[PDB]
Amino acid sequence: DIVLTQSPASLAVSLGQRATMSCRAGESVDIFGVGFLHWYQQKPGQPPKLLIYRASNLESGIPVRFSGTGSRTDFTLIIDPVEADDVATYYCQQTNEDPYTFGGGTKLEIKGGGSGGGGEVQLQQSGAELVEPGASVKLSCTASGFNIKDTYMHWVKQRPEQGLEWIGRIDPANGNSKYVPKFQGKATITADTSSNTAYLQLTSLTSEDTAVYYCAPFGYYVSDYAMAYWGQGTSVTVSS
Amino acid sequence: DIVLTQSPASLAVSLGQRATMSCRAGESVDIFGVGFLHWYQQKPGQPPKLLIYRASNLESGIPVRFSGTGSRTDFTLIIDPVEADDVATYYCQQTNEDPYTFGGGTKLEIKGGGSGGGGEVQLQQSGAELVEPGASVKLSCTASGFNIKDTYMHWVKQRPEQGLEWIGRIDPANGNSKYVPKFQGKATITADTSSNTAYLQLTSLTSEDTAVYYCAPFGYYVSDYAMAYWGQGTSVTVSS
């Protein structure tokens, strides 16, 4: 049959950087130009998920940061940039002929370190509160899966049955914050890099402040294309 | 600011019908042909869930029945066909400039529809098995969303922390099974046309049989280019 050998066996890359794994087949799995080789990503304790079929064609939903290339017996899978939930094992399979074989697979892990835990980014908002007019809150949102310095932490407000309203963001890497003008000296955002936590301080409350507040990373190496990751949002109710 | 306007405020659609909502910007959100408008779905109690990014890019893991559309200032979200899991509120956000405004959101909800029927392709396999060496287990794979009668049902074996082994396939439309030579007198694949389920059977089990097993419709009218769908994986163990 056709034996597929992948390399490296273990691969670790810093976040937002380029990863490169190859897959070498004993024979040619190429047919009329089309390489009958596929790439599968497999999350810890999960079924293998198809990313690329026939050497270069991205499966629906797969972002273009995944490149599939190669000729007759030499294939390369590239991920640029690598994101937080990329920790997994990538296998190549050939369907040119049966038995259909798989490869050894490259175990990809982010240099953010950690022998345990595989990606699965999440955000933890502080508990629901009950304040009164004149009160002041300081919500938190701890991040796991990625370092908060590798991105921007955003806070969004949402009133009962109403659209979302960006509040502002903060860059944990150097402390710079930016707010929507109407929230400048009302809300003040901060972050403790020691504890990887994001805080949102809201002063002198009003019933206009009753709402659910979300934290969402987005800006550099974490979710620079939209807000894919949202905190569960901590509810604040201002009843006089 | 850049004001986004969603419409209708709300609509009702019968299952299986086409649903389309718009979001129009009072100012362009395009940058060199790229529309930085995003779509998020939101159900009661949960935070927003990214669906489409940059006008028309299907987010990893979202169903194909979701389409993003538009340019510069007029954008449309298309859900076709509508499934009941779709009842929720959809928002559009623009990240063309800060502040990252959001639209008012549109509320979709099923209306009395004398139709529907469109369950996604899902593979459901039996529960974990723990047996003694010598015993012969039998794993099951129940499909829905497609008839296992119009494709090949495959089984893949993945021992603890290792590669994947294509064991064999069976054509539910005639019992025609094919196995990797190394699995001839140890593996047996069978499938009931009516039950619409395939069974994997391993006899005289062994320590080297302890492994996770998956099933996958590959070929013809289901996944004829690669293995896009997988069962969850029947974990099988043998100690004594």
Curated annotation (Swiss-Prot), chains A, B:
Framework-1: annotated segments: 1-23
Keywords for the protein's UniProt record, in alphabetical order: Adaptive immunity, Disulfide bond, Immunity, Immunoglobulin
Chain residue ranges for the region called Complementarity-determining-2: 54-60
Location of the region described as Framework-3 in the Swiss-Prot/TrEMBL record: 61-92
Record keyword Disulfide bond present: yes
GO biological process, one term: adaptive immune response
Species this protein is from: Mus musculus (Mouse)
Region (Framework-4): 102-111
Start and end residues of each stretch annotated as Complementarity-determining-3: 93-101
Entry's Gene Ontology cellular component terms: immunoglobulin complex
Region (Framework-2): 39-53
Name this polypeptide is given: Ig kappa chain V-III region PC 3741/TEPC 111
Highest taxon, organism lineage: Eukaryota
